[PDB]
Amino acid sequence: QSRSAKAGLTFPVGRVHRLLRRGNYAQRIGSGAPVYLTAVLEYLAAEILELAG
């Protein structure tokens, strides 16, 4: 399974990893940080979508 769906989530991981890789935010990057961004933004999106419903 790809990294965008290995954790069973909704938001893509490769998209935010490509955004930080060329956005020049650090020298290196840990493996847990893009999926952590994935989890935080998908939880914020799900909460505001439940409130929108």
Partner DNA sequence: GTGCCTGGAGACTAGGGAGTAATCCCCTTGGCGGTTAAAACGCGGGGGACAGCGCGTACGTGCGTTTAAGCGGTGCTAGAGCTGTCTACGACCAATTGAGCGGCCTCGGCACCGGGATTCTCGA
For DNA, the binding residues (CB under 7 A) are 1-6, 12-15, 17-18, 27-28
Minimum distance, C-beta of residue 52 to DNA, in the bound complex (Å): 25
CA dihedral 40, 14, 28, 31 (to 10 degrees): 60
Nearer to DNA, 14 or 40 (CB): 14
Nearer to DNA, 6 or 49 (CB): 6
Nearer to DNA, 27 or 53 (CB): 27
Rounded to whole angstroms, how far apart are CA atoms 1 and 5? 7
Q: What is the DSSP letter of 1?
A: -
